[PDB]
């Protein structure tokens, strides 16, 4: 009569790699690399996007007449700019610090548009429009020009009596010629000034031809500022100035999440949003995109990070089948557990799982997986940024951060999986060996350690004796 200690072999096709071996068959494995997304742009935990289908961010900021105003309590956590959004500034010119302005507007926790300089309080003409601007003009500024061939110096003030800062906008106009300068502002040499308690800026007139844009040869330089609570904004000009009209109240701003994308919008909530799609993921790594916002696994460019869970899955080589245990390989027949017993006595042969050692092993492998997954922080995000033509150095520095961080995570995740897989396979060997040593102690000198998982019993052992050996109540000292 014999009793043998073995472990499960299964129909699984899974293989993994380890630090020391390639393509080892295993009975169970777990992917650590999240690989799927829902092909949509969704809400995150921080909020919902603002989709812009015909207007650029700065079109909304300055109030391009082809753009809708924003709803008076809207919030958004990121901005989507479709390839059809082409309405930015409409009158030919340039925006100062456009990248910083777009970042500033890229998020809001509760939007409000506030009037700052009522258009009827100006003493000159304030109604001018332009064909470049849909035969209208901007909705957040007013173009001042001469009235009755005169342009006395205008001066007006506004105090921020709100609880949050206000983003405000203005521009300086440079006509295409001296006659255009006279026609619009009468005075040939003008001075415009913007000031607060924190800043003072002076602008002097100029005119002359420029490269024609849709027929127009004058130019505007667009500027912007932030008026903090209780500060006062003074506007002064005797020509060439497009003055503020309405400001935007800034609440929860400058998160920077801007996405130029054609991916369809959806009605969905997601932990992690990328340009090509969003997803929920408990895994610590992902191969979907280097840029993502929300609560995001670290990005790793590779196809798989497969962790071994179960054991080496090579059965004992069938060639009648002799009798052996764990030393020769696994048992294709073992069912209810990872490790178990096969016995041979005069009532026949049988095979039963050992639930204790199996559950101990499962708890250990489960806490290993949970530690590898749970220790990963998911607070910070890596997002795409915009840089101007004279910002290639900071562009390179930004990319260097993203790339060096990626190299660290790729190497550490690959090596961690390889090292842990080696350990896990060795741990299963240790577990089944420890089951075998327990029985050895329990059987004492009543059995010869063939040792190949198998024990030759020096006395007959029927099914009841076999059960006592399995459930650990067999006494090696018994007399019957």
Ligand X SMILES: CC(=O)N[C@@H]1[C@@H](O)[C@H](O)[C@@H](CO)O[C@H]1O
User: Closer CB to a second copy, residue 263 or residue 425?
Assistant: 425
The one among 211, 321, 479, 480 contacting a second copy by CB under 8 A = 211
Residue 230 interface partner, choices ligand X, a second copy, none, CB cut-off 5-8 Å depending on type: ligand X
Q: Which of residues 186-205 bind a second copy (CB under 8 A)?
A: 191, 193, 195-200, 202, 204
Q: Which residues bind ligand X (CB under 6 A)?
A: 122-123, 154-156, 229-230
Residue 368 interface partner, choices ligand X, a second copy, none, CB cut-off 5-8 Å depending on type: a second copy
Residue 229 interface partner, choices ligand X, a second copy, none, CB cut-off 5-8 Å depending on type: ligand X
Alpha-carbon gap, residue 97 to 100, rounded angstroms: 5
Residue 443, φ and ψ in degrees, nearest 5: -95, -20
User: Closer CB to ligand X, residue 176 or residue 406?
Assistant: 176
Residue 134 interface partner, choices ligand X, a second copy, none, CB cut-off 5-8 Å depending on type: none
Considering the rule CB under 8 A, would residue 322 count as an interface residue with a second copy?
no
Considering the rule CB under 8 A, would residue 394 count as an interface residue with a second copy?
yes
The one among 16, 104, 242, 283 contacting a second copy by CB under 8 A = 104
- Cα distances (angstroms) measured from residue 66 to each of 62, 87, 262: 11, 7, 21
Considering the rule CB under 8 A, would residue 401 count as an interface residue with a second copy?
yes
Can you name the residues that pair with 293 across neighbouring β-strands?
273
- Cα distances (angstroms) measured from residue 343 to each of 282, 315, 318, 436: 43, 18, 18, 14
> CB neighbours of 23 closer than 8 A, spacing ≥ 6?
15, 17
Give how many residues touch a second copy by CB under 8 A.
Answer: 86
- The nearest distance, CB 276 to ligand X, in angstroms, is 28
**CB-based burial label for 468 (10 Å; 0-12, 13-18, 19+):** middle
Considering the rule CB under 8 A, would residue 347 count as an interface residue with a second copy?
no
Q: Which of residues 284-313 bind a second copy (CB under 8 A)?
A: 298
Alpha-carbon gap, residue 296 to 280, rounded angstroms: 9
Considering the rule CB under 8 A, would residue 21 count as an interface residue with a second copy?
yes
CB atoms within 10 A of CB 159: 12
Considering the rule CB under 8 A, would residue 128 count as an interface residue with a second copy?
no
The one among 99, 164, 182, 467 contacting a second copy by CB under 8 A = 99
User: Closer CB to a second copy, residue 161 or residue 375?
Assistant: 375
Considering the rule CB under 8 A, would residue 34 count as an interface residue with a second copy?
no
Alpha-carbon gap, residue 226 to 460, rounded angstroms: 93
Considering the rule CB under 8 A, would residue 236 count as an interface residue with a second copy?
yes
- The nearest distance, CB 163 to ligand X, in angstroms, is 7
Considering the rule CB under 8 A, would residue 451 count as an interface residue with a second copy?
yes
Residue 398, φ and ψ in degrees, nearest 5: -60, -45
Residue 411 interface partner, choices ligand X, a second copy, none, CB cut-off 5-8 Å depending on type: a second copy
Considering the rule CB under 8 A, would residue 319 count as an interface residue with a second copy?
no
Residue 111 interface partner, choices a second copy, ligand X, none, CB cut-off 5-8 Å depending on type: none
Considering the rule CB under 8 A, would residue 94 count as an interface residue with a second copy?
yes
Residue with tokens 């190949």, as numbered in its chain? 452
The one among 84, 97, 150, 230 contacting a second copy by CB under 8 A = 97
Strand 265-269, strand 41-43: pairing? parallel
User: Which stretches does DSSP call E strand in 346-477?
Assistant: 348-353, 447-449, 454-457
Angle CA(267)–CA(73)–CA(65) in degrees, nearest 5? 90
Residue 154 interface partner, choices ligand X, a second copy, none, CB cut-off 5-8 Å depending on type: ligand X
The one among 260, 400, 462, 471 contacting a second copy by CB under 8 A = 400
- The nearest distance, CB 124 to ligand X, in angstroms, is 8
Closest to 94 (Cα-Cα) out of 205, 206, 213, 222:
222
User: Buried b / exposed e across 50-72, counting CB within 10 Å, b at 16+?
Assistant: bebeebbbbbbbbbbbebeebee
Considering the rule CB under 8 A, would residue 397 count as an interface residue with a second copy?
yes
Residue of this chain nearest to ligand X (CB atom): 154
Q: Which residue stretch of 91-99, 132-140, 303-311, 456-464 sits at the interface with a second copy (rule: CB under 8 A)?
A: 91-99
Residue 208, φ and ψ in degrees, nearest 5: 145, 170
- Cα distances (angstroms) measured from residue 47 to each of 56, 275, 296, 384, 454: 20, 16, 15, 19, 63
- Cα distances (angstroms) measured from residue 276 to each of 131, 269, 314, 367: 38, 15, 41, 33
CB atoms within 10 A of CB 353: 18
Considering the rule CB under 8 A, would residue 398 count as an interface residue with a second copy?
yes
């Amino acid at each position: 009569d014999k009793i043998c200690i073995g472990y499960q072999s299964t129909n699984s096709t899974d293989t993994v790699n380890t630090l020391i071996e390639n393509d080892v068959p295993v009975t169970q494995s777990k992917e650590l690399l999240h690989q799927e997304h829902n092909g949509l742009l969704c809400s995150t935990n921080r909020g919902s996007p603002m989709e812009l289908d015909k207007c650029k961010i700065e079109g909304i900021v300055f109030g391009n007449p082809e753009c809708d105003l924003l709803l008076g309590g809207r919030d958004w956590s990121y901005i989507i700019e479709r390839d059809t959004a082409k309405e930015g500034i409409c009158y030919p010119g340039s925006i100062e610090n456009i990248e910083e302005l777009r970042v500033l507007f890229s998020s809001s926790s509760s939007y409000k548009r506030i009037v700052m300089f009522p258009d009827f309080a100006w003493n000159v003409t304030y109604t001018t429009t332009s064909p470049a601007c849909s035969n209208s003009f901007y909705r957040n500024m007013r173009w001042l020009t001469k009235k009755s061939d005169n342009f006395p110096t205008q001066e007006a003030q506004f105090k921020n009596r709100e609880s949050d800062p206000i983003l405000f906008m203005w521009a300086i106009h440079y006509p295409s010629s001296q006659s255009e300068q006279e026609y619009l502002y009468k005075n040939l040499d003008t001075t415009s000034s913007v000031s607060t308690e924190d800043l003072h800026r002076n602008f002097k007139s100029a005119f002359g031809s420029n490269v024609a844009i849709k027929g127009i040869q004058g130019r505007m330089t667009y500027s912007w500022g932030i008026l903090k609570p209780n500060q006062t904004l003074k506007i002064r000009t005797n020509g060439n100035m497009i003055v503020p009209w309405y400001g935007h109240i800034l609440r929860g701003e400058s998160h920077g999440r801007i996405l130029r994308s054609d991916t369809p919008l959806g009605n969905c909530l997601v932990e992690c949003q990328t340009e090509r799609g969003g997803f929920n993921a408990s895994l610590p790594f992902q191969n979907i995109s280097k840029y993502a916002f929300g609560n995001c696994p670290k990005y790793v460019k590779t196809n798989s990070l497969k962790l071994a869970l179960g054991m080496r899955n090579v059965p004992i080589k069938e060639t009648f089948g002799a009798i052996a245990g764990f030393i020769e390989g696994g048992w294709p027949g073992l069912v209810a557990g990872w490790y178990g017993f096969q016995h041979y006595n005069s009532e026949g042969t049988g095979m039963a799982a050992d639930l204790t050692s199996t559950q101990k092993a499962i708890d250990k492998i489960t806490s290993k997986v949970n530690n590898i997954i749970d220790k990963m922080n998911k607070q910070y995000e890596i997002i795409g940024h915009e840089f101007s033509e004279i910002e290639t150095r900071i562009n390179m520095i930004n990319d260097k951060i993203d790339d060096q961080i990626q190299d660290i995570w790729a190497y550490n995740a690959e090596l961690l999986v390889l090292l842990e897989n080696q350990k896990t396979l060795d741990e299963h060997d240790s577990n089944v060996r420890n089951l075998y040593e327990r029985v050895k102690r329990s059987l004492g000198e009543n059995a010869i350690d063939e040792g190949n998982g198998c024990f030759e019993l020096l006395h007959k052992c029927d099914n009841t004796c076999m059960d006592t050996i399995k459930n650990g109540t067999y006494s090696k000292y018994q007399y019957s």
